[PDB]
Structure formats: structure tokens, C-alpha cells
């Protein structure tokens, strides 16, 4: 096809305010401040050849340690998970290689197309270490990306900002704005 | 001013390439005295931070910022490899 760039979004993307530049302290998170937002994903060109299927890596929800009972809302544990890259899987688009379904209950952190999928990244290291090297005997990779916008995430503080990192505000700056940037 | 390290690219990668330390510009040509070796690294071309939020309740079918706890995590992955040459010193 002719060269060109696509574009993906979400009608209810979890984007509080524009944190790239603000003239006054942002209002206050009410209920559902999600916005209809789109973006042009990171560019990726790659080709893997081998006599065994390709292997990828992505962060998923690791198994918890049998101790402290996971309080609801507690941050889930991470675990790098090796998987077989299947036809139709999604490529990291700028939000890294992770399982958004099992790591984002929100269902609104990223555009629809990766929103309930897993973005996997070729595990080049593992494949090349492979003793016989059947999984891949040749490859070409080309990826590039830059920050277009800087946003805030609505929701509630999962982990508070240690107060030794700042001086308490007052009035409007009395309440700390979400420092969960993306 | 507010900084900005522009776009990141494969073509500009420094890592995942072998470095052949044959001729050093210093007098110590790669000798690891003390059987020690220091490898310092800084790579901001993989600084993606991922936000993961858990729901406090899996009931209501209506979004409530109060129902979800937002967090941030970042992962780094390394793999160091070396080729060493045995050397002798007549004392």
C-alpha cells in the first residue's frame, strides 16, 4: 500500500489535565473526567526469520506472595512474561509492552485497539541466546518515537507522594494534583 | 527552560552492539586489576513508565475516579556479556 500513518484513540481516555504547561492550578477531579483522545503510535518496522515461531516479552500481573492479603485496589505485582508471538498480536505502541487487560482495570488508559490486548516486544536477547538458534537466524528492526503531549491520570492516589519531596501548599495548592503523568 | 530529549531511534542505539577494547587510549589497556571490572551505563531511550490501576470495586458499571487506584512502575532489562583474555606478569 502507499506509505502513510494511522491513528488510534479512545472516546473515554483517562486524561485529566494538560500538564505540559498550565497557567493556573487545575480544578478538581469529579466523577469521570475522561476525554475523547487520539494519537499517532510509535513507528515500528521489523522482520524476524527462523524455523521456529518468534518469542516475545511483556509485563503482566505476577503471582502474589502468600502473606499480606492483597487489599482491593492494591497495586498488582509485575512479571516479565515470555510468550509466543502469534499472528494478530499487537506491537508496543508507545506505552511499552504490557498486558493492559490484567494491569488496567480502568479500561480507559490507552486507545481501543490495544486497550484489552497485550502489546508484546520481540525478546531478541532470549532468542539469540537460544543454543541452536532456530527461532531466528536473521532480523531487521527499526523503531522510533517521541513525546507529543504530556498528560495527567484521573483516579485516586495509589501511592502518595512522600512529603519530604515538597513543601505543602495552601488554598488551591493545598491539595496535590495527580502526579501520575503519562 | 523546559528540556526535551527529542525522538529516540534504533539507528542511534549504542547498546546491543559489541565493543572491542583492543587499543586503549589510556596506559591501562583493559587489564582488570583486582579481578574487578566496572561497567557504567545510562540509557534513557527505554524510559517508558507504565501506569497500572486496580479497581477498588468490580461492581458498578459507571466510571468513578474514586473506584480506581492509579500507580506508576518502570522496568529496566539488562544482559551483560564479556570476552576475557588471560594474561601473565613475570614478577
Amino acid at each position, epitope marked *: 500500500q502507499p506509505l502513510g500513518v494511522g491513528i488510534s484513540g479512545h472516546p473515554l481516555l483517562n486524561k485529566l489535565d494538560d500538564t505540559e504547561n498550565a497557567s493556573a492550578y487545575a480544578a*478538581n477531579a469529579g466523577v469521570d473526567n475522561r476525554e475523547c483522545i487520539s494519537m499517532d503510535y510509535k513507528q515500528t518496522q521489523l522482520c524476524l526469520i527462523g524455523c521456529k515461531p518468534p518469542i516475545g516479552e511483556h509485563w503482566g500481573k505476577g503471582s502474589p506472595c502468600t502473606q499480606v*492479603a492483597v*487489599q*482491593p*485496589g492494591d497495586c498488582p505485582p509485575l512479571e516479565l512474561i515470555n510468550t509466543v508471538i502469534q499472528d494478530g498480536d499487537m506491537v508496543d505502541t508507545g506505552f511499552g509492552a504490557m498486558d493492559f487487560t490484567t494491569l488496567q482495570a480502568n479500561k480507559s488508559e490507552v486507545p481501543l485497539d490495544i486497550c484489552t490486548s497485550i502489546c508484546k516486544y520481540p525478546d531478541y536477547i532470549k532468542m539469540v541466546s537460544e543454543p541452536y538458534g532456530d527461532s531466528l537466524f536473521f532480523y531487521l528492526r527499526r523503531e522510533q518515537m517521541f513525546v507529543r503531549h504530556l498528560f495527567n491520570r484521573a483516579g*485516586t*492516589v495509589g501511592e*502518595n507522594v512522600p512529603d519530604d519531596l515538597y513543601i*505543602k501548599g*495552601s*488554598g*488551591s495548592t*493545598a*491539595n496535590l494534583a495527580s502526579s501520575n503523568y503519562f | 527552560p523546559t528540556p526535551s530529549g527529542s525522538m529516540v531511534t534504533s539507528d542511534a542505539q549504542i547498546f546491543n552492539k559489541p565493543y572491542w577494547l583492543q587499543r586503549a587510549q589510556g596506559h591501562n589497556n583493559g587489564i582488570c586489576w583486582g579481578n574487578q571490572l566496572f561497567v557504567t551505563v545510562v540509557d534513557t531511550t527505554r524510559s517508558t513508565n507504565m501506569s497500572l490501576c486496580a479497581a*477498588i*470495586s468490580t461492581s458498578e458499571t459507571t466510571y468513578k*475516579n*474514586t*473506584n480506581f487506584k492509579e500507580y506508576l512502575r518502570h522496568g529496566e532489562e539488562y544482559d551483560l556479556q564479556f570476552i576475557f583474555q588471560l594474561c601473565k606478569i613475570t614478577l
Partner: antibody
Amino acid sequence: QLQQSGAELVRPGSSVKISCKASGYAFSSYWMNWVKQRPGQGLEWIGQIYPGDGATNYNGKFKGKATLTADKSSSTAFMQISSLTSEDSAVYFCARPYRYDGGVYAMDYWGQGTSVTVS
Amino acid sequence: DIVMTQSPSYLSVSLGGRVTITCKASDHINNWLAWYQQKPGNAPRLLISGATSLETGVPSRFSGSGSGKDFTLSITSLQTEDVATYHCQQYWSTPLTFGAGTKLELKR
């Protein structure tokens, strides 16, 4: 709806642990605020607790005297007072922050109050 | 800390008239102030938040206003059920502070 403990009578020097059980909402999203009122007198702020990680802020007056805790599994707040004296005899109240993890816009839901007599 | 004080600690009033209770902060709290009403056997009841906002269930004869450091609660056509002690509270900075209270009594 918040439920507090019944009346207490403790001897000077002793100690008491009082509960405030939460009901009618999702506790795991809210702090708990506690205050003090002596007979025929005004209100004073003790502290507030984030149950999740046990973080809490103290009014200097109640630093060594008060400790706050909470049972997430049963959604209950607790406050313990140490080395009790005649000045600690008062009615204590538990109260919920209006705005989730924020402590502004006042306290919108209060407990019935628990009376403590040191004698 | 921020110190809240109310003008009088007591007022003798008549049913049907307008009653005003003003509170003044030791510092600027910028409309971050609440009013509570308390009767002899129960917890204080929130009437005002954000200096001017009426809470659900609060009769419309109650209202509040002011700014900076000076605020006031106003009750029109005072009802007998309105006879109680009223408190202001600042929440602009911790520790949170309450005024000493103003008790309404009926004159005879």
C-alpha cells in the same frame, strides 16, 4: 452509617481502644477523621488515617497520646489513647472526609460519639 | 496552626428574626470554611462547606458568606429547632481548626 463503641470508664494511667465501623459504602477509598469535645466545650482535631498503608497525620497535642489504626477487611477505624488523665475525659467522634482521599469541603458523615471517663 | 474565633459565644434571640454569627480566621483561608450546628445530645451537623454552599437537607433560611478571613452564617426567620450551638471550621491548612462556638438562647 458509622457505629462507635459504648461508653468507657478507665482508671488514670490505663488505656482504651475505641472502634468506628463503616457501613453503606466502599471503605477502601476513604480516610477516617477523629475529634475531641470536652463537656460543655468546643471541638478539637486529633488526626486522620489512611487505612491502606497506615499513614496518618497528628495534631501535636495528641502525638504521644494517640495512635490510629484500621482493619480494611472489616472496614473499621481504631484509636487508642495512652497514659490517661482527667484531661482525657471527653466525648470522641469519628468522621468521614467528604472527597475520598482529600480532607477539604468538611466532614459529611459523623459517628454517634463515644464517652470516655478517666476516674 | 490557624486559629478560628467567633465574635460572641452567645446570643439571646427571638423567634422569627434574622440571626448572624461571624467567625474570623487568624489568617487568610480563602473560602475554605465550614459551619456546623450541634444540639445537646448529638454530633455536629454540617450546614455549610466552601463558605457559601448549602448541604443537602439544610433549610434554605440558612446561608453563609465572606472571604479571606471573615465569614458569617445567617439564619432568617429563626425557628425554635434552630436554637443550638454553631461552629465554624477552617480546612485550608492542618491541623484543622474549629471556632469556640456560638450558642443561641431564646430571650424572655
